[PDB]
Amino acid sequence: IRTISKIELSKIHNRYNLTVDFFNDLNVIHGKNGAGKSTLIHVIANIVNGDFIRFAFLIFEEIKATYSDGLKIVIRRDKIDEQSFISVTLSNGKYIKFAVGEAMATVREIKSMLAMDIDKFVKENELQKVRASYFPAFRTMLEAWSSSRSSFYNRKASAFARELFGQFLPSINYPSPMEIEDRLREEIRRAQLGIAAYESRTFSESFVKVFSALFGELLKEIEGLAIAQDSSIKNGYYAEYSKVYEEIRSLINRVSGALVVYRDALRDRQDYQEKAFSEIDNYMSSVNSFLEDKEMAYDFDLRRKYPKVGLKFPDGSWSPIRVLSSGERQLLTMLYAASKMGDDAIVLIDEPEISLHIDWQEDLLKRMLSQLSGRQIIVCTHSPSIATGYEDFMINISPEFI
Amino acid sequence: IRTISKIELSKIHNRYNLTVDFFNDLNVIHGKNGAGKSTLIHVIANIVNGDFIRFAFLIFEEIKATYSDGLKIVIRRDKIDEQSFISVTLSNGKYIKFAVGEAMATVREISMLAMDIDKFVKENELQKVRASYFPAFRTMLEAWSSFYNRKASAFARELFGQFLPSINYPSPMEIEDRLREEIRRAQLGIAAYESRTFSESFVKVFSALFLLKEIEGLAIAQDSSIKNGYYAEYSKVYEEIRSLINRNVSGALVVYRDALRDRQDYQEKAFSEIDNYMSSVNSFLEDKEMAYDFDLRRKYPKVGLKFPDGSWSPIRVLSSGERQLLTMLYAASKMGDDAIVLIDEPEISLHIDWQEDLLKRMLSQLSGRQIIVCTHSPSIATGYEDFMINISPEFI
Amino acid sequence: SCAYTIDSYITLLTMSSKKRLLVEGRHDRSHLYQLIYKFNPASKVKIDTAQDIKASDKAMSKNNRLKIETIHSKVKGKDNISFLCDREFREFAFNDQIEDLLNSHYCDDSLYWTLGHSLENYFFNPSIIIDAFQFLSPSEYKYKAIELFSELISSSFAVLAAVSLAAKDIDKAGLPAALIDWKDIVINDGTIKLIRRDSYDIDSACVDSFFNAFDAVLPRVIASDVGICSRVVRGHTGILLLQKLFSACLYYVGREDDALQADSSANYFCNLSELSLTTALAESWVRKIGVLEDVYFPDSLLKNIE
Numbered sequence A: 001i002r003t004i005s006k007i008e009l010s011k012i013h014n015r016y017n018l019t020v021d022f023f024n025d026l027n028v029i030h031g032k033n034g035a036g037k038s039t040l041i042h043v044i045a046n047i048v049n050g051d052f053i054r055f056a057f058l059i060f061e062e063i064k065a066t067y068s069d070g071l072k073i074v075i076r077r078d079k080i081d082e083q084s085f086i087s088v089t090l091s092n093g094k095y096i097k098f099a100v101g102e103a104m105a106t107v108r109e110i111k112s113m114l115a116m117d118i119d120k121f122v123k124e125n126e127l128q129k130v131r132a133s134y135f136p137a138f139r140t141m142l143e144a145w146s147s148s149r150s151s152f153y154n155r156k157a158s159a160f161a162r163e164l165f166g167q168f169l170p171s172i173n174y175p176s177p178m179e180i181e182d183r184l185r186e187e188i189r190r191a192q193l194g195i196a197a198y199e200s201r202t203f204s205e206s207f208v209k210v211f212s213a214l215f216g217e218l219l220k221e222i223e224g225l226a227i228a229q230d231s232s233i234k235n236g237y238y239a240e241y242s243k244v245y246e247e248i249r250s251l252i253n254r255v256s257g258a259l260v261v262y263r264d265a266l267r268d269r270q271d272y273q274e275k276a277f278s279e280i281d282n283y284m285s286s287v288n289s290f291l292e293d294k295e296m297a298y299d300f301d302l303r304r305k306y307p308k309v310g311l312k313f314p315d316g317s318w319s320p321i322r323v324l325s326s327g328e329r330q331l332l333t334m335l336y337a338a339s340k341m342g343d344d345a346i347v348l349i350d351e352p353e354i355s356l357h358i359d360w361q362e363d364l365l366k367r368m369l370s371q372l373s374g375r376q377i378i379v380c381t382h383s384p385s386i387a388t389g390y391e392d393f394m395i396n397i398s399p400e401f402i
Numbered sequence B: 001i002r003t004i005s006k007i008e009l010s011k012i013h014n015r016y017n018l019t020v021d022f023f024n025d026l027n028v029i030h031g032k033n034g035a036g037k038s039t040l041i042h043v044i045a046n047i048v049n050g051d052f053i054r055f056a057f058l059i060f061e062e063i064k065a066t067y068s069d070g071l072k073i074v075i076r077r078d079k080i081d082e083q084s085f086i087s088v089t090l091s092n093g094k095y096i097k098f099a100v101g102e103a104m105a106t107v108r109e110i111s112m113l114a115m116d117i118d119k120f121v122k123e124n125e126l127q128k129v130r131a132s133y134f135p136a137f138r139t140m141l142e143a144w145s146s147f148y149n150r151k152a153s154a155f156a157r158e159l160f161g162q163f164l165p166s167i168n169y170p171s172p173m174e175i176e177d178r179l180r181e182e183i184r185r186a187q188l189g190i191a192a193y194e195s196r197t198f199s200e201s202f203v204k205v206f207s208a209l210f211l212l213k214e215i216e217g218l219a220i221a222q223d224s225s226i227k228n229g230y231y232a233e234y235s236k237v238y239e240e241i242r243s244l245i246n247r248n249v250s251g252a253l254v255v256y257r258d259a260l261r262d263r264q265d266y267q268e269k270a271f272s273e274i275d276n277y278m279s280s281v282n283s284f285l286e287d288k289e290m291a292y293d294f295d296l297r298r299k300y301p302k303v304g305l306k307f308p309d310g311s312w313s314p315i316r317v318l319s320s321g322e323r324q325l326l327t328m329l330y331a332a333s334k335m336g337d338d339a340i341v342l343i344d345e346p347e348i349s350l351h352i353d354w355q356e357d358l359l360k361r362m363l364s365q366l367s368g369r370q371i372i373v374c375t376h377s378p379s380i381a382t383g384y385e386d387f388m389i390n391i392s393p394e395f396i
Numbered sequence C: 001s002c003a004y005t006i007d008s009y010i011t012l013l014t015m016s017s018k019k020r021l022l023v024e025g026r027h028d029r030s031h032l033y034q035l036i037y038k039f040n041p042a043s044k045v046k047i048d049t050a051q052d053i054k055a056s057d058k059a060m061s062k063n064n065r066l067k068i069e070t071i072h073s074k075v076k077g078k079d080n081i082s083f084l085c086d087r088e089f090r091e092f093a094f095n096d097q098i099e100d101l102l103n104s105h106y107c108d109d110s111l112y113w114t115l116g117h118s119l120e121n122y123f124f125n126p127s128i129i130i131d132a133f134q135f136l137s138p139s140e141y142k143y144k145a146i147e148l149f150s151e152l153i154s155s156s157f158a159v160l161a162a163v164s165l166a167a168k169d170i171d172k173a174g175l176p177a178a179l180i181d182w183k184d185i186v187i188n189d190g191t192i193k194l195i196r197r198d199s200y201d202i203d204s205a206c207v208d209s210f211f212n213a214f215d216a217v218l219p220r221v222i223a224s225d226v227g228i229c230s231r232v233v234r235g236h237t238g239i240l241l242l243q244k245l246f247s248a249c250l251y252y253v254g255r256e257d258d259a260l261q262a263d264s265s266a267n268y269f270c271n272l273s274e275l276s277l278t279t280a281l282a283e284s285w286v287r288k289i290g291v292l293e294d295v296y297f298p299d300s301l302l303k304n305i306e
């Protein structure tokens, strides 16, 4: 798990230098208009993702990037005999050099020889350990375009955005609502299977304990825990613990420590249900601190084969996630990107204030960091509300014009 | 010309109602997520432009828009024989009713209904004032330039539903083209005035036929100016005249001073709109300077940025925020055409410093045209809380 | 609404690069904008108002001075922010002769207090009021009323300060607004007296509570330099009372000549909006700065800003 410690861009567009030092938890980058914020985020995303062929579309003289581990990537663009040459050098002495003509030819064609050489270089030197979840400023328009894309496929959207916004634009990998729904379904399935495995194992162990044994307030505690794990979501596939407690009490009224194992069996199970569903529960609680008149919930029923994940309204009407507005979709996506149920990323968000009221803006970063994922977040923003309470993490970029 | 005074939307989307009253100069609309802000701007844009054919794509019960002049356009969607009808009734007593099926079929094809709508619009003086519409998606559509209005509107309707107004905000490319055209017009007016001044100066000298420090200053000022860079032979003339006068009446010098002052005044008046717009834009941009150069011997004026090293760049190199600033300021400039300006979230990609001077600098350009804004940023409404509206739907 | 919050405003201060001035209300914003524009018509200063900053605490929801003090405490040191809070009755001693403990503009780390009770007290030089009432007042006999004012203002400011101080003592800010009316005042050889009417909306207990303290104070307020009296009055009540006194002068002048015209003029100006009077006075005060010597202004604040 690396993180950017310094980006020193020189002669970007042949008009301004820009050196920036980063933190490891949160970096709110602000600055006057035309200061290089978007260019800085684009450089970061392109270096992190390993896409070194896009630097042939940017005019510069140096891009030095220092990682937390200690790897230093130096990218030059030197003109030799009127031919441009992008050379990438690492800290261990390995370099790759390719001509801008071949890079543009490969971009126009689309795995050319240049692409294969770059890919082998990146793979050998381990320059793709951490991905980069890039949230473009034009989120709403792109989301309307698609579905009228995923964190992995993300190929048609990237091509469209590159045609519209030049060929240095980092690939769009931010997770869409559809991928979030699929991921939540998969996580719920995994949690269900884990809970079933735990039930099997604990049944075996408790039977062993009871067989080994064969050679007052307990009832109240059993009832108190039985009510908890009976009328709660995540156990709708079976909600008859009240009957079990009633029958146990009836039989007792009609050895002494036998009921003790019951409290253990229920206790451990309840604890497991709060660790298997931990990530989804945290993410949904974070999301529901924003939505009003709708809550995001998962329903388990015996009739329906697939556990349903979607919005719940007070009247009891479920609905797919697509019904949410633009602001809700953005909230959901960024909160997922910062949630524990990702893979690995350096979440880059450009203008997180698009289509958000001040109320949600003030609580956005606080709730994103509330999930202790540890993923480095870089936010290029103009809204003072987004940065409230994090004035000590702010980075002001002021490029030094030549 | 005209200006909306009230809007009474009923059963919009079968979910809520609304009733908003608008001021005459500036209206700032703020509210929580889900409020009918975008729908309200769309309704006002569609009603002003006369695009009543678009109301076949909205689910409503009765819309009532009243201008300052006195018209009280009232659009009613109803069901007769299980067929949806949109009836547009004016305050004059007229009425046109068209079927939703015909509108949907025509929009799919693109007709008799379109011709009837146009006839109603033109006969009753309904297209008097257009409405610039700055959507929430300006960078994507602006970048979708690789009529601009027609293609962009088709795209934006394929994306964001068919009720969206026609997108006719002045794009940066159109801004550059219009600036160049205004530059050419200023130059040609200067030429015409030069000919007329030559004639009248011959007349004035002849009439004479039957302070030098001020002329020195005026000649020095006029010689060094991008506006009058072509001739540029003013210092030499003044020096020669001074030498001749010393060697050797003053009425000729008086006539010359009058002529030079008149030419300078006309030059200031010809480039008035362009210079004012460029000054307004340059109150914002830092480290750059929007400027023009009518020189090179290549007869095409240059309009573009001027960094502080003599390096020129085109307008396409600007960032999103600077381009949006350009666009909005032009929409508020005297070079714009349509009165009503409907800007949806003018706080996109704009620094707080610029948000805090945007409305002052747009109202300072003395266009006198109505501006309606829908903003989520407190920085745009500062100093204008007397002109701030809050809309709350009465969810039914 | 869509106003900022205290933390959001501190973040805005650290983000922005302009020079800012934080005033308590929205009228002070206009007046100080006029002052700054006069001294430098091309000024990049922004005047923000605490009234448009939301505070979560219920106590702070209406106390703008506490808001300014909080923001100053949390952002002390920054060199692109200046604060201007009003002086209320702080540092004012009412032991016999009304005395000002601090005779200059209090300054404490970018926080500046007003010389008097508020910005509206700079307007209380005889020259400013006399000049600024002509521009708006009709003429039943204009110059006559101006001349009668020119003299009556000497005791008028003492009486107005007494009214404000009595209101402060009885802990009823708005009482002078409604209790006193233009027909109420009485003029006797350039001496202002405040007769007590019979009917009053507030309970007669309130009327007594005011008038007793007023009578007690009057000797106290008639033994200090008129400058202190002009400093110790309140803004809105002072403006309203001055409106009423000019109305009374109009009636006194016009009663001898014609009853109808005098009554019309007096009852007219008695309805003129407070915003109009305050704007006219601000225009006169800004237009009459430095040229005279008895006209004050927040010089220290203007020096600190820019």
Ligand SMILES: Nc1ncnc2c1ncn2[C@@H]1O[C@H](COP(=O)(O)OP(=O)(O)OP(O)(O)=S)[C@@H](O)[C@H]1O
Binding pocket: A013, A015, A032, A033, A034, A035, A036, A037, A038, A039, A040, B313, B317, B318, B319, B320, B321, B322, B349, B350
């Ligand atoms: N050929 C060029 N293409 C793009 N940018 C250029 C070029 N030449 C110079 N520049 C500079 O690059 C800047 C763009 O910086 P960006 O990072 O895209 O803007 P930004 O930091 O996102 O600010 P905002 O918020 O988008 S207005 C311009 O303001 C120019 O000063």
Ligand SMILES: Nc1ncnc2c1ncn2[C@@H]1O[C@H](COP(=O)(O)OP(=O)(O)OP(O)(O)=S)[C@@H](O)[C@H]1O
Binding pocket: A325, A326, A327, A355, B013, B015, B032, B033, B034, B035, B036, B037, B038, B039
């Ligand atoms: N096709 C539709 N059918 C039903 N309701 C809709 C439809 N389109 C929009 N709405 C709702 O109409 C209301 C107003 O429209 P919106 O565009 O969402 O206003 P808005 O949400 O305040 O705009 P912002 O700035 O993006 S939050 C919202 O509650 C929407 O959910």
